[PDB]
């Protein structure tokens, strides 16, 4: 280990200090492949605005460009999508004005222009995804304004608005009230849409509690008539048509939560009644309508709040989350196949089991995400994974039968969380750079620091480098989003009086050469057992990657395409989920009818639609792209009759 040498001179001339102000920093990046960062210091009545365009090595003061006005961080730096170059800062105005004033730029923060508004805004301005000139905003008077010219001229499109948000093709959705305000009429609201910037309108829902969008689907919770309860309803067509979901109804204390979504399907958390602090994950079909209990006792706090649920973006099908035992202990579960099967994380080879474990030899890894952090454990960062860095998952954890309160070490996976190893002893902050070419790490310490750790071989061997003589009290890392750069920015302040500072290191001269057709190796994703013909078949297909060698030392590059190739497996029965009304009694068997449809199953089979209710007892897993193999031969059967059979119906 530790083979890289002649490294001190390589980092020294590329280390780039820059100092700011006496002891509220606020950092926003502006566009990919630009190097444009914007700092907003706030003294609390004074503000100061800075600007690099060389990945935070050197900045220049542009407080002058906003007429040195006090800016409200509450709204914060509203950055536009893509490389539109748009920045909008919301100024404080003296009380008793007609409306507020905003500082707006559409040229990567080179020339800001002042603009007074006809209203006082309550929220940050929302940039349409389709067109970067199109903004909307909700006033203090609960009024939805819209501007087509990058916030130049605003038109109030509706009078009483509780929540609004954009969709695809410049479509605005929003919720409105009548007699009272929002909190009073919560439940009695109605949901509008406008296709055309408030010219035309359509009441696409009524007696709404709230609404939301995930991937392809529009969701809306709807109160029942003569009841305090509500039910989720799903539109795949901007609310022209609706269908009630196959999920249970909940009271006003309970909540729903879109854990994750895409074109294929949605993970839906449904809170368990009685102030339990947990619920149940359900995964959808491609319709978004039929659901399927994925995970029981999924940990999720009171009144919304925090969960450990985590899309491991560095491998397809992988999600981590945390669950509560009957015991009242917390264990971390992993799914490798989009929440069909869940299970314990493999115990690291380089680890003994902690005091939580009954057995000293055998236990599992457990992960510190948002919940550990909320409960004030010594956890600087949640888990990290970049999709370009295939395989790589970095997180803090305990090794045992539950999450332990002790000061955790940092563990790493290189295969999407099948296997793990201790990366660094004790808590660190970490950032992936150049698509897994260089991992970088800073220690979390009570006292100040002057060194940075880096690994060219994906966490297996670390190299220490002193980046400063006069040390700093570290606060955070900043890298360019996308994790393709090699320009980390190390932020902190001097020993206590005190002031802000940022040492920025390029790693160009460390990875001196670019990579070649020899550096990459073949790597199968999801390798259970190579002796099996169907090894790596997740969601009906395999993927084999070209992956950077650990031993090899080179830049992947800013234009590094992740090279993979699919292999489409045969369809077994496992690639099909059971449609409504059917289940699996025996483990690994056929989908067969449940005899007693009870609870929200009975609710759906009565109150529903015959299209979803008639079925052969099988549907393809969403995102499952198998070919050939088994196809359900079984005859279709209408399930509404069996349910209504028992009821005496009116003539």
């Amino acid at each position: 280990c530790g083979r890289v040498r002649d490294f001190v001179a390589k980092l020294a001339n590329n280390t780039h200090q820059h100092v700011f102000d006496d002891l509220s920093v606020s950092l926003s990046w502006v566009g990919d492949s630009t190097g444009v960062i914007l700092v907003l210091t706030t003294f609390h009545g004074q503000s100061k605005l800075y600007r690099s365009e060389d990945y935070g090595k050197n900045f220049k003061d542009i407080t002058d460009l906003i007429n040195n006005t006090f800016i409200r961080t509450e709204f914060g730096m509203a950055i536009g999508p893509e490389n539109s170059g748009k920045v909008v800062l919301t100024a404080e105005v003296s009380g008793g004005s007609r409306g507020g004033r905003i500082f707006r730029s559409s040229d990567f923060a080179k020339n800001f222009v002042q603009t007074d508004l006809p209203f006082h805004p309550l929220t940050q301005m929302m940039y349409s995804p389709q067109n970067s000139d199109y903004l909307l905003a909700l006033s203090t008077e609960n009024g939805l304004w819209v501007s087509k010219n990058f916030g130049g001229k605003w038109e109030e499109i509706h009078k009483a608005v509780c929540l609004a948000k954009w969709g695809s093709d410049n479509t605005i959705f929003f919720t409105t009230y009548a007699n009272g305000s929002c909190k009073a009429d919560l439940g009695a609201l109605e949901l509008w849409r406008t296709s055309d910037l408030g010219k035309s309108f359509k009441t696409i829902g009524v007696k709404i509690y709230s609404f939301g969008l995930g991937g392809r689907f529009l969701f809306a919770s709807v109160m029942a008539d003569k009841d305090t309860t509500r039910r989720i309803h799903v539109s795949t067509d901007q609310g022209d048509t609706w269908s009630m979901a196959q999920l249970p109804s909940v009271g006003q204390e309970q909540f729903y939560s879109i854990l994750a979504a895409n074109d294929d399907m949605v993970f839906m958390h449904v809170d368990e009644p009685g102030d339990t602090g947990f619920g149940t994950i359900f995964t959808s079909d491609d319709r978004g309508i039929v659901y399927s209990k994925s995970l029981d006792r999924h940990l999720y706090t009171t009144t919304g709040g925090e969960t450990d649920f985590t899309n491991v973006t560095s491998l397809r099908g992988v999600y981590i989350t945390s669950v509560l035992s009957e015991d009242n202990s917390i264990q971390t579960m992993i799914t490798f196949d989009q929440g069909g099967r869940w299970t314990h994380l493999r115990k690291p080879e380089n680890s003994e089991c902690d005091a939580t474990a009954k057995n000293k030899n055998e236990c599992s890894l457990h992960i510190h995400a948002s919940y550990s952090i909320s409960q004030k454990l010594n956890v600087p960062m949640a888990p990290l994974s970049e999709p370009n860095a295939v395989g790589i998952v970095i997180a803090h954890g305990s090794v045992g039968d539950a999450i332990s309160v002790m000061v955790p070490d940092v563990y790493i996976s290189d295969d999407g969380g099948y296997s793990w190893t201790k990366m660094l002893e004790g808590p660190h902050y970490y950032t992936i750079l150049d698509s897994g070419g260089i991992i970088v790490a800073i220690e979390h310490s009570s006292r100040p620091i002057n060194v940075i750790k880096f690994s060219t071989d994906e966490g297996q061997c670390w190299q220490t480098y002193t980046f400063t003589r006069d040390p700093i009290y570290f606060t955070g890392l900043a890298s360019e989003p996308g994790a393709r750069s090699m320009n980390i920015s190390i932020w902190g302040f001097t020993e206590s009086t005190s002031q802000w500072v940022s040492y920025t290191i390029d790693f160009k001269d460390i990875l001196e050469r670019n990579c070649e057709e020899k550096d990459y190796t073949i790597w199968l994703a999801h390798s259970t057992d190579p002796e099996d013909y169907e090894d790596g078949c997740i969601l009906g297909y395999k993927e084999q990657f070209l992956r950077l060698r650990k031993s090899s030392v080179c830049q992947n590059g800013r234009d590094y395409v992740v090279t993979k190739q699919p292999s489409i497996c045969l369809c077994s029965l496992e690639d099909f989920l059971c449609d409504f009304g059917y289940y699996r009694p025996e483990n690994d068997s056929k989908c067969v009818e449940q005899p007693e449809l009870k609870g929200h199953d009975l609710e759906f089979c009565l109150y529903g639609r015959e299209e979803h209710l008639t079925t052969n007892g099988y549907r393809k897993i969403p995102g499952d792209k198998c070919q050939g193999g088994v196809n359900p031969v079984r005859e279709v059967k209408d399930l509404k009759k069996k349910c209504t059979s028992n009821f005496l119906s009116p003539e």
């Binding site: 509220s24 920093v25 950092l27 914060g76 939301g212 909540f255 729903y256 879109i258």
Partner: peptide, 11 residues
């Protein structure tokens, strides 16, 4: 020190 960035919509 803050460096803002997908929130989970609650219904």
């Amino acid at each position: 020190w803050d460096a803002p960035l997908a929130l989970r919509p609650i219904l």
